[PDB]
Ligand binder design. Sequence first.
Ligand SMILES: Cc1ccccc1Cn1nnc2ccc(C(=O)[C@H]3C(=O)CCC[C@@H]3O)c(C)c2c1=O
Ligand SMILES: Cc1ccccc1Cn1nnc2ccc(C(=O)[C@H]3C(=O)CCC[C@@H]3O)c(C)c2c1=O
Ligand SMILES: [Co+2]
Ligand SMILES: [Co+2]
Lengths: 379, 379
Amino acid sequence: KNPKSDKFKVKRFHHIEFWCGDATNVARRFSWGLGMRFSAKSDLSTGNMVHASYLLTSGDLRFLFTAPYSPSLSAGEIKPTTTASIPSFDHGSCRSFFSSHGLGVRAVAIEVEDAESAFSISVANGAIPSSPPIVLNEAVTIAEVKLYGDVVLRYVSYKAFLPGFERVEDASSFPLDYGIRRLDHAVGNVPELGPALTYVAGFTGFHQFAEFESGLNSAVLASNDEMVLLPINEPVHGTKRKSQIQTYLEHNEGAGLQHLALMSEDIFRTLREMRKRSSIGGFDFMPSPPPTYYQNLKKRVGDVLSDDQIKECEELGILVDRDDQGTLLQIFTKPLGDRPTIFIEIIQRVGCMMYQSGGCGGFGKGNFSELFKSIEEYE
Amino acid sequence: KNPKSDKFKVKRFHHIEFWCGDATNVARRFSWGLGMRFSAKSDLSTGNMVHASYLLTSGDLRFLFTAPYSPSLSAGEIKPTTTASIPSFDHGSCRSFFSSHGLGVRAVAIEVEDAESAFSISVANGAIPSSPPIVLNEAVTIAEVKLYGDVVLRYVSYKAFLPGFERVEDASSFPLDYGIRRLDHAVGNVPELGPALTYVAGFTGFHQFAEFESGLNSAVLASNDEMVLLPINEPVHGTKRKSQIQTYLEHNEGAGLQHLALMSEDIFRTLREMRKRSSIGGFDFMPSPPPTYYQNLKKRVGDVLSDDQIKECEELGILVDRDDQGTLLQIFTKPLGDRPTIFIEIIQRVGCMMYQSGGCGGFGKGNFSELFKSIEEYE
Ligand SMILES: Cc1ccccc1Cn1nnc2ccc(C(=O)[C@H]3C(=O)CCC[C@@H]3O)c(C)c2c1=O
Ligand SMILES: Cc1ccccc1Cn1nnc2ccc(C(=O)[C@H]3C(=O)CCC[C@@H]3O)c(C)c2c1=O
Ligand SMILES: [Co+2]
Ligand SMILES: [Co+2]
C-alpha cells in the first residue's frame, strides 16, 4: 500500500554532507576507501573565507565534507556580505556538532521541485525550521529543517554542484571508481521511534514502506516513488546482548544518522576493491559470517544466485536477504571514524523490474536471525 | 661552535603527536600518503574511555594521532582512576586546540635520560609547566612544558610505545614503507623570534646551530650532539610579497608548529611513492621549480650529484642546497590539512661522515634566493 501522500514534489537524494574538523583528511580518506572522485570545491582558493567544503562523487552519489576556518578570517563579514557558499553554515553550530558527535552526517539533502515551497509546507506541517530558503545566484534554492538529533533534512531545487563551487582540476581529480552509483537509503537512530516517525511523516507526507530480539524496532518512511528511503531505529532494552542502537546513542550523545546505504552496480567488484584497500587507508568490514551462513544460502536464494555467485559471497563476506518481490545483497563497514556510531552499507538489489522499483528486497532485517542462527549451528 | 650546554641529557626525537577531531581518518590518510605502518593503539578497544590514539611508524619516525571521545564516557573517572593512556590529555584542552588551530602538532616529544629531572630543571630555568611528571606502570615517565603557542615539548624517559598501548594486529597492520626513517627537525612559527629563542634556549640549554627578502628571520636551537633540531621563524613585514610566516600566524590563530622534516634513506624512492599517491588520498607537493633551477644545478652541486641524479631531481621537483660541510636534498608538501599552516618536508643529507653528523648541509635557506633567481631568469 502506497498512498503517495508527499506534501510537495520530491525527486531523488541529492547529497550527504559530513561536518568535520578537517575536511581535507576526511575527504581524501573517503575518496581512496570508496573510489569516489574529487569533483568540486569551495574553500580559500575559491574565495570562501568561512568554510572548507570538498565534494566527492561516484555515479550519482555525492558526499560533501565541510569544516570551519578560523572565524577571524571572516569576522568583518555579515550575512549579506558572506563568502560562504553554503549560507546555512555557522561556525558555532559546526564546532558544537563535531565536539558533541564527532565525525558524522549533518545534512541529508534531497532534490525537490521548489525548495521554498517544500520549506513552507514542511514548517506549516510541524517541521522545525533550521535555515530559511535562500536563493543562490538566482539559480539554486536551499532550505533546511530538523530531521532528528542535529541532523537536518536539506531541500535543494534548481531553476535550470552549487554556485560558488568550482570544478576540481583534472590533475587534482583522479577518476577512481569501484562501482558505487547512488544513495539507496539513509538511516537514523533515535531514543523513541514513535515520536520520530510522527514528526517526519507529519511534515513530509512520506508513507510507511511495507516490511517483509535483534535489539531494535524500526520503520521506513518513503517518498511517492519510494526512491527517497529514510529508515529510523529505536533501541530495545532489557536484552541479554546490549542494543547497538543504545550503544550508538551513548557514544553519539543522542540521536543521529546511523548508516548510509550505497547502491553498487556490481557489489562483487566494489567489495573486492574496498577490501584491497582496508589496511592501506580505506574502510574495514564487519566480521564475516561463519560458513554455515553460506551453506544455508542455497536453500534461501539458490533460485537467484548460482553456486559460483554464492561462494563468491562467502569470499567477500556479503550478506543476502529476500522479501516477496526481490533479493538483497548487502555488507556493512566498521564505523567510519573514532566512535562506534556511523557506518556504511554497500548494497545491490536484484529484481522488481518495470527501471527498478525502490527498496526492492527490503532492508535485510531477516539477516539478523539468519546471522545468529548460522553462528549457533556453526558451533 | 658547539658549547654542549644542554641542562639535562637529551637523546633523540621520540614522537610527534597531532591533536585531531577524528584520529582514525587522519591516521589512515597519513599512513597511505607517507607509507607509515599502523603500529600501536589506545582507544575503546583497549579500555581507554577518554581518547582515541593511533601510532604510525616508519623506521624511527613515530606519528601519534589523538582525538577526544565524548566526556560522558569517562564522567565517572577522576585522575587517580583515569583510563587515559596519556595522562596529560584533557578533553577541553584538545577541543580548544583543534577549534583554534585546526589539525596540527600538539606535542614535540624527545626522549631523555630522566623526564622528572628534565621537567624540574626546565621549570627551574624558566620553562612554563604544562603537565607534571607522571610515572606510567612504573616503566615510563612523561612530562610536558610549553614550547610555543599551544605546542608542548614532551619529555619521555624509560627505566628499561607507552603503557596501555597495544600492538596492532598483523591483518590490521600492512607493512607500508616509502623510505622515511626519522624526524630530522621540527620548526615553529612565532610572532617574535628573539623572545621565543631566549625562552627555549633558556630552559633547555640548547645552543644556536651555525648557519651557512625571503619573508622570514630564523634561528635553530640544537642539543649537544645536534640531533634534536628546533628551528624557529618570525615574519618579516613590509615586503612586496606577504610573508608566509605571517599567513601562517593568521590562519593558525598564532604561533605553532610550521613544518616537520622527515629524513629519507632514499629521497628519490620516497618522492616517487608519495607522488604516485598524491591524487588518490596522499599528499600534494608544492609547485616544482622551473627548468632554469635544474640547469643551474650543475654549477652548484655537479661534484656531488651526477647528471643522472640531477635530471631525476628535475623529474620529482626535488630542491638542493649546500653549506660548507654537506649537501641537502629537500622538497615540501602542500599543507597537510584545510588551513595553510602545517606542511611536511622530505629531506636527505649527503656528507659529514665521522654515522652522519646532525644538520649536515643546513636547512636549505639558500634555496630561497635560488628559487626566485631561477624563476626570474626562466622568463
Ligand atoms: C552490527 C550488528 C549488531 C547486532 C546484530 C547484527 C549486526 C549486523 N547486522 N545484521 N543485519 C543487519 C540487517 C539490516 C541492517 C540495516 O541495514 C537496517 C536498515 O537499513 C533499516 C532497518 C534497520 C536495519 O538494521 C543492518 C544494519 C544489519 C546489521 O548491522
Ligand atoms: C613556501 C615558500 C614561500 C616563499 C618562498 C619560498 C617558499 C618555498 N621554500 N623555499 N625554500 C625553503 C628553504 C628552506 C625551508 C625550511 O625548511 C626552513 C627550515 O627548516 C629552518 C629555516 C627556515 C626554513 O624556511 C623552506 C620551508 C623553504 C620553502 O618553503
Ligand atoms: Co540498511
Ligand atoms: Co626545514
